[PDB]
Enzyme design. Structure first.
Site, PDB file in Angstrom:
ATOM      1  N   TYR A 208      36.885  -7.770 -29.155  1.00  0.00           N
ATOM      2  CA  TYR A 208      36.871  -6.412 -29.114  1.00  0.00           C
ATOM      3  C   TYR A 208      37.388  -5.495 -28.334  1.00  0.00           C
ATOM      4  CZ  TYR A 208      34.760  -2.171 -31.073  1.00  0.00           C
ATOM      5  OH  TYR A 208      34.675  -0.857 -31.526  1.00  0.00           O
TER       6      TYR A 208
ATOM      7  N   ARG B  85      41.983   0.897 -30.097  1.00  0.00           N
ATOM      8  CA  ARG B  85      40.876   0.503 -30.750  1.00  0.00           C
ATOM      9  C   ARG B  85      40.342   1.689 -31.753  1.00  0.00           C
ATOM     10  NH1 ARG B  85      36.215  -1.840 -27.041  1.00  0.00           N
ATOM     11  NH2 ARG B  85      35.270   0.095 -27.849  1.00  0.00           N
ATOM     12  N   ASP B  86      39.683   1.025 -32.732  1.00  0.00           N
ATOM     13  CA  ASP B  86      39.046   2.084 -33.724  1.00  0.00           C
ATOM     14  C   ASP B  86      39.841   3.215 -34.063  1.00  0.00           C
ATOM     15  OD1 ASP B  86      36.484   0.403 -33.043  1.00  0.00           O
ATOM     16  OD2 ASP B  86      37.096   1.100 -31.012  1.00  0.00           O
TER      17      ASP B  86
ATOM     18  N   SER C 198      37.054   6.814 -29.249  1.00  0.00           N
ATOM     19  CA  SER C 198      37.238   5.402 -29.075  1.00  0.00           C
ATOM     20  C   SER C 198      36.994   4.975 -27.570  1.00  0.00           C
ATOM     21  CB  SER C 198      38.586   4.428 -29.167  1.00  0.00           C
ATOM     22  OG  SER C 198      38.190   3.144 -29.197  1.00  0.00           O
TER      23      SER C 198
ATOM     24  N   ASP D  27      36.444  -3.321 -36.808  1.00  0.00           N
ATOM     25  CA  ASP D  27      36.912  -2.103 -36.987  1.00  0.00           C
ATOM     26  C   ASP D  27      38.258  -1.981 -36.722  1.00  0.00           C
ATOM     27  OD1 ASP D  27      36.769   0.504 -37.537  1.00  0.00           O
ATOM     28  OD2 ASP D  27      36.412   1.229 -35.343  1.00  0.00           O
TER      29      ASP D  27
ATOM     30  N   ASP E  56      24.946   3.005 -30.525  1.00  0.00           N
ATOM     31  CA  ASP E  56      26.192   2.896 -31.128  1.00  0.00           C
ATOM     32  C   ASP E  56      27.080   4.098 -30.680  1.00  0.00           C
ATOM     33  OD1 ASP E  56      25.492   1.129 -33.079  1.00  0.00           O
ATOM     34  OD2 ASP E  56      24.588   2.399 -34.379  1.00  0.00           O
TER      35      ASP E  56
END
Length: 358
Positions: A83, A88-89, A95, A135, A313
């Protein structure tokens, strides 16, 4: 199919999550709930390699698993999540990813993969199962109008290809992230998704180590719902089994006998969300079905706990530079700390609301 990666192996229990849980159970004052909380450290979870700084910890986990295997006459299996894509994301408001496409992102990602391979190569007696990039590719099905995602498309594809090709050389069993029923399970999204995942499998050489797809990672959907959650109206694929039953034949038609793993770590309590897209620290969640290869489906190799329940999260603090406003919605538990850090009140509820009970 005939080769389920978990059959005949003992799962190495994450020492990091075991330490979080042990520390958390001490702070639970009810002695009976504290005992139930402590037992969570014996439930296998995935370890997230979400930055290059975690790669040396992977080496320690492989070495410890190898020795435990010899000590007990067992074969050990380590569960990891890859990940760290650049940018990313891409569709998220914030992010935490450390690499950016503009600053040599792909080259830094390839070096991250090379260092992971170098660790795995040293312990061939340990089996590794990897979830590849939550994701990521699901955004290329539905989120290409997000400029950051459109700009990241070729890098996401090239980086995932590098990971699949190189981890296959050291025998890692891989499941690519495939979103969840409320993302890719919409009937209109199934064919575009099947086309994308099949293309990626072909480009990586159709390796048998590319086992299939992972669903519901870090989400909350039921595997098999008694009745549809109201947030699902309009989608006939209202749980993960419906999504998998609808997508698996499309992959088989293209020549890929793909199987699936499904995260159920925070799925114990349904009908707790106001909208299907709400993902951040959903209030009232409970631990769901414990990991098992008794899945009841020809397409599912295992129920797994990918996201470790209790690790936050995202923060509800609107002054944080990592703030994602999804974490401020009414169905989100607040106040919440920074992503990745321990959220004690949330863990306590996961234990209390566990279904089945702990």
């Amino acid at each position: 199919s005939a080769n389920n990666p978990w059959t005949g192996f003992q799962i190495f229990l994450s020492p990091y999550y075991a330490n979080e849980v042990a520390a958390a159970a001490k702070q639970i004052t009810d002695p009976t709930l504290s005992s139930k909380a402590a037992s969570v450290a014996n439930i296998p979870t995935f370890t997230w390699l979400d930055s290059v700084a975690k790669i040396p910890d992977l080496g320690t986990y492989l070495a410890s698993a190898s020795a435990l295997g010899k000590s007990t006459g067992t074969k050990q299996l380590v569960q990891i999540v890859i990940y760290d894509l650049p940018d990313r994301d891409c569709a998220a408001k914030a992010s935490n990813g450390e690499f950016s496409i503009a600053n040599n992102g792909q080259a830094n990602y390839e070096n991250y993969i090379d260092q992971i391979v170098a660790q795995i190569q040293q312990f061939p007696d340990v089996r590794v199962v990897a979830v590849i990039e939550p994701d990521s590719l699901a955004n290329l099905v539905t989120n290409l109008n997000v400029q950051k995602c459109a700009n990241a498309k070729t890098t996401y594809l090239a980086c995932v290809n590098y990971a699949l090709t190189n981890l296959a050389k050291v025998g890692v069993y891989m499941y690519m992230d495939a979103g969840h029923a409320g993302w890719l399970g919409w009937p209109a999204n199934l064919s575009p998704a099947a086309q994308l995942f099949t293309q990626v499998w072909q480009n990586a050489g159709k390796s048998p180590f590319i086992k299939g797809l992972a669903t519901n990672v870090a989400n909350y959907n039921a595997l098999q719902a008694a009745s549809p959650d109201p947030i699902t109206q309009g989608n006939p694929n209202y749980d993960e089994i419906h999504y998998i039953n609808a997508l698996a034949p499309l992959l088989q038609q293209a020549g890929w006998d793909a199987t699936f793993i499904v995260d159920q770590g925070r799925s114990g309590v349904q009908n707790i969300r106001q909208q299907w897209g709400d993902w951040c620290n959903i209030k009232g969640a409970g631990f769901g079905t414990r990991p098992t290869t008794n899945t009841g489906s020809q397409f599912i190799d295992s129920i797994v706990w990918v996201k470790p329940g209790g690790e936050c999260d995202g923060t509800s603090n609107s002054s944080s530079p990592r703030y994602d406003s999804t974490c401020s919605l009414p169905d989100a538990a607040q106040p919440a700390p920074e992503a990745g850090t321990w959220f004690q009140a949330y863990f306590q509820t996961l234990v209390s609301a566990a279904n089945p009970p702990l």
